[PDB]
Design a protein around this ligand. Structure first.
Ligand SMILES: Nc1ncnc2c1ncn2[C@@H]1O[C@H](COP(=O)(O)OP(=O)(O)O)[C@@H](O)[C@H]1O
Lengths: 64, 965, 339, 492
């Protein structure tokens, strides 16, 4: 039962070669990138910024 | 085709080479030879006189005379042809020989057997197919090997060995691992001591050396002697620890001694078995084939001989004609239903009609189920309601016979008359003169509608998918499996269990719920199952549990492989365990739709290999044939197939036992037909029995060793009981019975006993549970048995009196015991025995829900033991104040005795809850096959299923205090 | 030899990945986010309650219109709700009662569902006759359908218990691509903003980034001590969060190829059933198996608030495309909208 | 197309008097129609094979059987017979008789594959007695009629059929023309061979047809059915060249298919004012199975019973002392003008027949050539004991009137096979019995009685009746016992 273990172990090593052949980015820049995204869209997220009840379809009005 | 040389009787027996169609029928083949003989015969006159029926076709399979019984078998499947090709026998040889009529000895033997059974086995009146008869010819082969599988010496002596570990309390009563063997012999009573882990062979060898210089003969040798108990016949031989004998272990608890006596080997020839004549039926007897061979598709119409059941998509359809009751007992209407187990697969009623003694419909009902989706165990259930709606009759019919062929033609069936165990019966009313009759038609077919055998193949689904399921699903999967077997399974569970089938198979405790979901109404789903059960490594090695294997044998699981695996786990039990549940298994053959099975052949091979089992098996089946006519034909066929196996001696013993009972019932009933005249007439009647053939040596039914003898007429009396039992006091017939006492027996008429026999079986099962936990409560199971209808023999417990008599004679109870136990040491010992028994009976009855009774049914022994009687008629249980005063504590105070009362109960109560799986089955399975579901809940209501053990103590004691209240 | 040399080469490339990853681990997100103003307390109120389901709800999914939502339930029905009006636009009864997932198509025309029946049954809301007719039975999987998301009206990705995923073409009913590489049942998935990437969570306690275009595993993320129960992308598409039975959440950035943040608390001991981000992503909404749904600061990793509006396990939850409202389904047979 | 719709439309109308005539006529106009309708049937036949309905199998079996007998030629490429074999071959899993119809039909289809048109040549060769040494067969059609009661139009029909219009020389032309056309189809120029055969003499017409019939049957006797077509086609080449007409074949330019109709068989009309059948006996003056005698008897209630006893006598007389029956095989055909009961069972016979050359005459010929399923009614056998104490057997169907002191013994049956006697002798006035099982009408009681034993007193003579009969009467009876009991009647 070597042809299966070998056929499997080859996929593994051919897969790990795929994943390791990537140019990663420094975490500091990875974070900065994500932090600066929220900073940009903080206004456009009513979950973050409570919006006026008038603009809320779920509080002000029953007719839609 | 094939060449076969057939041997004719004409001189030397003439033989000619013929050929037979490869795909023909057994029957056809016969005609082919008939003509050639009639043409090639030197003197055809003899053949002219007779026909093919007079002769039988025998072929020797390695010296074995086989008979090709079935005349509808495929010629190809004949093992002779298959065997010859393996032998390369060409041309094959088969002989033709005329039949012969039975001789008187054969008729005499058959007449002998029929009297024992209470029925006839050759009766062919109230049947409509050769099922019953096929089985009889079929059970021979197991019984020849089983008989060939017994050894002479051990079979006759039948030691009652055991292999359970010694309980703790007995271990106390074994000092220095030794015991005393009081070897009685003639007059020379020689006493010796021996270790508790030796064997009789060693003891006898040493005993002669000790006495090397008793009435022993000089010429003989130690080879010629074997031990035997005194006052009974229960030999002690076989390589085994002397601690491993249920007899030795019995004395140690009793605080008594062992009294052995030398003996001589009982003669093996005394158990000879009459030679056999019936030829060996075909091995390829139940063989049909696979779907490929039995399907029209892919075949030319010229060579079509059978149709696989799975090729037919026509909706099942049945034509009724009418009903006919000769006696006038309103609106009525038949309501047919396809049932499996207890499931109403489909249903189709008919229009209301006027109620005349005969009502005609001539209507076709059509069933959604499809002929390719018929599960082997179907049962067309037919009802005749009355009108708001009341059931009045019923009847059932298999929709596949015993040889894998659908039912076709006109059938007239005689109906019974009213869930229950008997409402699943596949036999027709023998009352063919005043019984409601139904006439139906099943459509014919130019070919038989066979049904092939499932062909398991490797299943890659169980190979790749490891089913390493998400923890959320694994939580829910194991959430239901924990529940008790009584718990219903909703479809979501059914789908959930079904999908993770190859994973839930790893838990042996989940089987009764894995197979409660399978969809039996669809062929493809069933096909998957036969490969699900193809893998059984987990089940094979799992622990042998008997509170679970019973679940498979229960009614719900009617398939042919679900029950097959259950038996294979019972094949590992041992004689001691078999006897414990033997009454449980026998009443569980009443749910099989077929007659032959693994369960039936299992009881056969066990009885033939053991004697004590054989004795008890015989008196259980006979208790049913006479009682329940619904299944009497099923029981009778097996019983006779067994009586041919056990040697002559047991037959003689069986005959003598039945003779005695026969006379008593007449005397009993005759006396009940109607002061001192009764005893005068009784004794007058009794002294006549001596003048009759009343045997002078007959083993008591409930004790293969304890024989009896003549009556002590002066001690044969009638008690002032409404049902007026007969009291009998025989005297032991054993010459060397050290002590001499009466073998009391009671004969109560007017109360059926099956309810009480089963209960006493239960209380004997519970004892084994506490034995493993090394406890005791001093229960007293007294041998009770049933023999007819409302008639049965009971064992009498010496030195006992009903409490009510003492009551009519709370302090009253205290004085009676002290008078019976004047000595304080014995009096205190009696209280100790009174605490154990009072607690144990209170605990056990509560589990079974019959504790609430009257003091009359409760009787107190002289030795301090207490126990109940007459639990056949039916507060948590009885704890009357008089017990409390005897406990040494009055009101609510406490003493060392009272604390033991409450401590022992707690130990016992929590001991049983470990085996609630075993009790939930036994209890209600009895309720089903016992008296003629809400009532069941008492097993699950107060037994505290799935709760903290501490709360069970609280909840349990919440009843004792209430009983005290 | 041949298998051991490949095993020893394998176990060297792994530490090259750990070393290639440890190199970028210059600072943690907790350091960088120390300065940013904390998110505060997200005091949320139950605006709507969606009654009508008879048993446990297994899945729900917002439509691209941010008003409609489907819900699959143990009671075997697939209901379409009008979140704004609470009215049931459709009450579709199902063939298999063991539905486990649902996914409103982005176009709004199709809805899909599936479960232990091993089929992804596609339903049409806008039918010829105005009926609710089944367009397709995407069959072929050898395990229960665990989750699925529409790429379009004609394409849909589904995950299953076969330890593999697959891309389907709805018209042909054929597995376009098969995503092998996982070693366990795939509990959840999430498509990247670009339809060319999607993540998937499995019981093997690992995540894998797939290229929808090709069908290969690009990166493999670890860190969870238990099954991954839920997974979703960071709004931009460069990070994603995973829910597990180990009572912890984790954030992963695609570019950094490692864990950035853990969202957990000593009190939190039960597994995570579901996750969702707010429109901006500053908020991570985690469902829990204690009837609660705690609100974490995605940057600070501090629990800003708690949604406790369910009587049974909070099985599923979602966020609208506009982040205007949050639905949360549960085993109590009720969904709840929040604002 | 309109033709397909009309052919399909006509099919549905019939299967929902002379409707069957319309369908057969509408398909004979064009050779193509035959290959059109057959397909629509197989679609219907394979539908019931799926839906499994029972009411609509026998009608569809005969329509397929008739059309294949009337099909000119099957294209060598077309294989509509193989499609037919598949649909019917999956009926063996059906109840009897639904599997009875098909198993014979499957045998019929396989013969067509071997020797196409073999079915048509067998029928006509015996319908006109054009037998031969190898092929020996015959058939005779006879009309027994009562001019007093029967309508005039039928007599005209009887006269029309009795005319031996066709001549044996003409018959060979039709048979030989049809045989070659079927094998070769439109390829052959029928007009060219038609002229050739007209010249050749009857003796050589007999020779060619006999060998052709032998070749047609022999090909059906060859194992394979596909190449047998070529093998049979090969022999047809030899006969044409030996006889000298090979040009019409081998025609690269095909000829045309002509719808040859079914020739009328031989018929002989007779008057049947007599209620007996002695007239049949008279004619016999001037193989048992190779010849069949189809006798058609018209319908009238008053004629019925007497026909039954007359029919029974023929069964008695013959079955006991067979004279006519031995020579040939009998087939009777009642014609309402009994039928009530025959209707109740088969709605086909009710509509086609009971619903009642010219169309009416044309439809009748369809009924007699295809109806092949007898239907037998139950009759009562009773024996009368005269004052002399003898025994005379009598058979009655409808009723029985008899007749004051008298001995009556009767028993009541039940479907369950259990019988219960009832012996209540009682003086009465008269005894009447109607066939509702008989019904004992005592005078004023009435009960369905199964077995009855009527015993007189002191050998007292009395008169008895039989189904209200006024001709066959026995009197001076003392006792009688009544209990319920080739030349089959024919229905569909
Ligand atoms: N094994 C036994 N030993 C002694 N007496 C018994 C035994 N079994 C029953 N009895 C007596 O039978 C009486 C109980 O009634 P029983 O005969 O069992 O039912 P019933 O009262 O309906 O006849 C008590 O008086 C009791 O003494």
């Amino acid at each position: 039962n070597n042809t299966a273990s070998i056929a499997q172990a080859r996929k593994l090593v051919e897969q790990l070669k795929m994943e390791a052949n990537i140019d990663r980015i420094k975490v500091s820049k990875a974070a900065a990138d994500l932090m600066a995204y929220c900073e940009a869209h903080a206004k456009e997220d009513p979950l973050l910024t409570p919006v006026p009840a008038s603009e809320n379809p779920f509080r002000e009005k029953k007719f839609f | 085709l094939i060449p076969i040389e057939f041997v004719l009787p004409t001189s030397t027996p003439e033989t000619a080479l013929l050929h037979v169609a490869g795909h023909g029928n057994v029957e056809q083949m016969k005609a082919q030879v008939w003509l050639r003989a009639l043409e090639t015969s030197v003197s055809a006159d003899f053949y002219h006189r007779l026909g093919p029926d007079h002769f039988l076709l025998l072929y020797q399979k390695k010296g074995q005379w086989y008979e090709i019984y079935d005349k509808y078998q495929v010629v190809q499947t004949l093992d002779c042809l298959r065997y010859w090709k393996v032998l390369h026998r060409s041309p094959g040889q088969i002989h033709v020989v005329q039949r012969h009529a039975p001789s008187e000895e054969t008729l005499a033997f058959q007449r002998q057997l029929n009297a024992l059974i209470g029925y006839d086995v050759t009766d062919v009146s109230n049947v409509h197919d050769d099922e019953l008869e096929f089985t009889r010819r079929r059970l021979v082969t197991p019984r020849m090997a089983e008989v060939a599988g017994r050894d002479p010496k051990l079979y006759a002596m039948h030691p009652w060995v055991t292999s359970k570990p010694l309980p703790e309390y007995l271990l106390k009563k074994i000092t220095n691992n030794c015991v005393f063997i009081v070897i009685h012999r003639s007059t020379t009573s020689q006493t010796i001591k021996v270790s508790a882990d030796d064997t009789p062979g060693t003891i006898l060898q040493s005993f002669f050396t000790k006495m090397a210089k008793m009435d022993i003969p000089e010429s003989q040798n130690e080879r010629d002697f074997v031990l035997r108990v005194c006052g009974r016949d229960e030999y002690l031989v076989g390589e085994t620890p002397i601690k491993n004998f249920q007899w030795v272990r019995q004395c140690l608890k009793n605080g008594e001694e062992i009294h052995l006596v030398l003996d001589t080997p009982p003669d093996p020839a005394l158990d000879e078995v009459r030679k056999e004549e019936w030829p060996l039926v075909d091995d390829c007897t139940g063989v049909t084939g696979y779907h490929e061979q039995l399907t029209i598709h892919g075949k030319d119409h010229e060579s079509v001989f059978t149709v696989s059941l799975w090729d037919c998509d026509r909706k099942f359809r049945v034509k009724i004609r009418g009903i006919d009751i000769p006696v006038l007992p309103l609106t009525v209407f038949v309501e047919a239903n396809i049932q499996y187990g207890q499931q109403v697969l489909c249903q189709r009623r008919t229009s209301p009609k006027p109620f005349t003694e005969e009502v005609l419909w001539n209507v076709w009902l059509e069933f959604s189920i499809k002929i390719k989706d018929l599960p082997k165990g179907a049962l067309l259930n037919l009802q005749i309601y009355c009108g708001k709606a009341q059931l009045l009759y019923y009847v059932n019919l298999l929709l596949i016979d015993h040889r894998f062929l659908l039912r076709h033609g006109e059938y007239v069936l005689h109906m019974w008359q009213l869930f229950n165990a008997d409402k699943l019966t596949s036999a027709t009313n023998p009352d063919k003169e005043n019984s409601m009759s139904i006439s139906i038609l099943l459509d014919n077919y130019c070919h038989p509608i066979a049904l092939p055998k499932h062909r398991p193949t490797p299943d890659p689904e169980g190979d790749r998918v490891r089913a390493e399921m998400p923890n959320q699903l694994r939580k829910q999967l194991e959430a239901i499996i924990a529940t008790d077997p009584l718990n219903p399974l909703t479809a979501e569970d059914k789908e959930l269990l079904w999908h993770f089938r190859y994973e839930s198979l790893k838990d042996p405790k989940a089987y009764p719920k894995l197979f409660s979901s399978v969809k039996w109404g669809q062929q493809e789903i069933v096909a998957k199952t036969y490969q699900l059960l193809a893998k059984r490594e987990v089940w094979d090695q799992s622990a042998l549990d008997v509170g679970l294997t019973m679940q498979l044998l229960d009614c719900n699981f009617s398939d042919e492989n679900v029950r097959a695996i259950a038996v294979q786990k019972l094949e590992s039990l041992e004689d001691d365990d078999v006897l414990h549940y033997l009454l449980q298994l026998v009443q569980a053959v009443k749910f099989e739709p077929y007659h032959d099975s693994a369960l039936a052949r299992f009881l056969l091979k066990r009885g033939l290999r053991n004697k004590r089992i054989g004795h008890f098996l015989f008196w259980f089946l006979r208790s049913e044939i006479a009682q329940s006519r619904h299944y009497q034909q099923r029981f009778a066929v097996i019983l006779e197939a067994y009586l041919r196996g056990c040697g002559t001696a047991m037959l003689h013993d069986f005959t003598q036992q039945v003779q005695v009972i026969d006379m008593l019932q007449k005397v009993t009933i005759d006396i009940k037909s109607l002061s001192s005249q009764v005893i005068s007439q009784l004794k007058q009647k009794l002294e006549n029995l001596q003048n009759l053939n009343l045997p002078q040596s007959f083993r008591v039914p409930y004790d293969p060793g304890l024989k009896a003898g003549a009556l002590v007429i002066e001690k044969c009396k009638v008690m002032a009981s409404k049902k007026k039992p007969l009291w009998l006091e025989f005297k032991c017939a054993d010459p060397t019975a050290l002590s001499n006492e009466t073998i009391g027996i009671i004969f109560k008429h007017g109360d059926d006993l099956r309810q009480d026999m089963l209960i006493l079986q239960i209380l004997r099962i519970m004892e084994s549970i506490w034995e493993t936990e090394s406890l005791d409560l001093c229960l007293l199971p007294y041998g009770c048995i049933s023999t007819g209808d409302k008639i049965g023999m009971i064992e009498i417990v010496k030195d006992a009196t009903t409490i009510a008599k003492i009551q009519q004679s709370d302090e009253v109870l205290s004085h009676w015991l002290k008078e019976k136990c004047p000595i304080e040491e014995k009096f205190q010992a009696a209280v100790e025995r009174f605490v154990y028994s009072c607690a144990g009976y209170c605990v056990a009855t509560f589990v079974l829900g019959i504790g609430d009774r009257h003091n009359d049914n409760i009787m107190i022994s002289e030795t301090g033991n207490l126990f109940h009687i007459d639990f056949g008629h039916i507060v948590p249980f009885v704890l009357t104040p008089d017990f409390l005063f005897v406990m040494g504590t009055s009101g609510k105070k406490t003493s060392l005795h009272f604390q033991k009362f409450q401590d022992v109960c707690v130990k016992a109560y929590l001991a049983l809850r470990h085996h609630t799986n075993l009790l939930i089955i036994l209890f209600s399975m009895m309720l089903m096959t016992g008296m003629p579901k809400e009532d069941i809940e008492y097993i699950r209501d107060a037994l505290t299923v799935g709760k903290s053990e501490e709360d069970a103590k609280k909840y349990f004691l919440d009843q004792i205090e209430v009983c005290r209240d | 030899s041949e298998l051991d040399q490949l095993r020893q080469e394998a176990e060297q490339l792994k530490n090259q990945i750990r070393d290639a990853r440890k190199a970028c681990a210059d600072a943690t997100l907790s350091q960088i986010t120390n300065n940013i103003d904390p998110v505060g307390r997200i005091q949320m109120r139950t605006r709507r309650t969606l009654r009508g389901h008879l048993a446990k709800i297994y899945a729900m999914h917002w439509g691209t219109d941010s008003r409609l939502l489907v819900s699959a339930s143990q009671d075997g029905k697939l209901i379409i709700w009008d979140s704004y009006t609470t009215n049931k636009v459709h009450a579709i009864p199902l063939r298999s009662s063991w539905v486990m997932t649902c996914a409103y198509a982005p176009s709004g025309n199709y809805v899909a569902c599936g479960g232990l029946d091993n089929i992804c049954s596609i339903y049409n809301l806008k039918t010829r006759e105005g009926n609710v007719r089944v367009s397709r039975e995407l069959a072929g999987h050898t395990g229960y359908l665990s989750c699925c998301r529409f790429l379009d009206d004609n394409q849909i990705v589904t995950s299953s218990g076969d330890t593999t995923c697959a891309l389907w073409d709805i018209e042909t009913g054929q597995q376009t691509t098969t995503f092998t590489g996982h070693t366990g049942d795939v509990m959840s998935l999430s498509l990247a903003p670009d339809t060319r990437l999607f993540v998937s969570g499995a019981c093997d306690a690992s995540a894998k980034l797939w290229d929808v275009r090709e069908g290969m595993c690009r990166q493999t993320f670890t860190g969870h001590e238990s099954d991954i129960n839920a997974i979703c992308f960071f709004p931009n598409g460069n990070a994603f969060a995973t829910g597990s039975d180990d009572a912890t959440c984790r954030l992963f950035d695609l570019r950094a190829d490692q864990e950035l943040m853990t969202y957990s608390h000593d009190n939190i001991i039960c597994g995570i059933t579901s996750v969702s981000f707010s429109k901006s992503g500053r908020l991570l909404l985690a469902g829990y198996d204690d009837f609660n749904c705690n609100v974490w600061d995605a940057l600070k990793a501090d629990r800003a608030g708690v949604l406790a509006g369910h009587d049974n396990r909070v099985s599923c939850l979602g966020v609208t495309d506009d982040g205007m409202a949050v639905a949360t389904g549960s085993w109590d047979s009720f969904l709840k909208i929040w604002n | 197309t309109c033709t397909e719709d009309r052919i399909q439309h006509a099919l549905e109308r019939c299967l929902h008097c002379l409707n069957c005539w319309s369908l057969q006529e509408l398909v004979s106009r064009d050779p193509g129609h035959f290959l059109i309708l057959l397909e629509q049937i197989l679609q219907k036949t394979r539908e019931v094979q799926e839906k499994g309905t029972y009411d609509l199998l026998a009608p569809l079996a005969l329509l397929f059987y008739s059309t294949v007998l009337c099909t000119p030629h099957f294209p060598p490429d077309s294989d509509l017979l193989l499609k037919a074999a598949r649909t019917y071959h999956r009926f063996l899993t059906w109840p009897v008789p639904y599997c009875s119809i098909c198993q014979e039909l499957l045998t019929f289809i396989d013969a067509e594959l071997k020797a196409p048109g073999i079915s048509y040549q067998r029928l006509v060769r015996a319908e006109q007695g054009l037998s031969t040494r190898s092929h020996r067969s015959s058939t005779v059609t006879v009309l027994l009629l009562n001019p007093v009661e029967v309508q005039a139009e039928f007599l005209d029909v009887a006269d029309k059929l009795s005319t031996p219009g066709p001549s044996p020389h003409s018959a060979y032309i039709t048979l030989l023309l049809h045989a070659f056309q079927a094998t070769f189809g439109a390829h052959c120029d029928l007009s060219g061979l038609h002229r050739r055969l007209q010249s050749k003499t009857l003796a050589e017409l007999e020779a060619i047809f006999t060998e052709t019939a032998e070749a047609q049957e022999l090909a059906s006797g060859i194992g394979d059915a596909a190449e047998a077509r070529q093998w049979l086609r090969t022999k047809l080449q030899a006969v044409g060249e030996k006889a000298g007409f090979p040009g019409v074949l081998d025609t690269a330019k095909p000829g045309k298919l002509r719808t040859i109709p079914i020739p009328v068989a031989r018929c002989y009309t007779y008057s049947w004012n007599q209620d007996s059948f002695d007239i049949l006996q008279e004619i016999l003056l001037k193989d048992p199975k190779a010849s069949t005698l189809r006798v058609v008897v018209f319908g009238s209630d008053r004629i019925s019973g007497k026909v039954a006893r007359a029919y029974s006598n023929l069964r008695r007389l013959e079955n006991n002392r067979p004279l006519l029956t031995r020579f040939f095989k009998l087939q009777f055909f009642y014609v309402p003008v009994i039928s009530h009961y025959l209707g109740m069972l088969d709605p086909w016979y009710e509509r086609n027949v009971l619903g009642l050359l010219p169309i009416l005459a044309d439809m009748l010929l369809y009924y007699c050539r295809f109806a092949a399923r007898p239907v037998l009614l139950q009759v009562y056998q009773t024996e009368l004991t005269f004052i002399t104490g003898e025994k005379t057997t009598e058979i009655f169907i409808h009723s029985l009137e008899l007749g004051l002191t008298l001995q009556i013994i009767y028993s009541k049956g039940a479907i369950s096979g259990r019988s219960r006697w009832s012996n209540m002798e009682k003086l009465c006035t008269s005894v009447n019995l109607s066939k509702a099982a008989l019904t004992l009408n005592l005078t004023t009681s009435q009960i369905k009685v199964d077995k009855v034993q009527i015993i007189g007193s002191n050998s007292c003579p009395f008169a008895v009746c039989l189904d209200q009969d006024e001709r066959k009467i026995l009197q001076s009876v003392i006792r009688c016992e009544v209990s319920p009991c080739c030349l089959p009647i024919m229905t569909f």
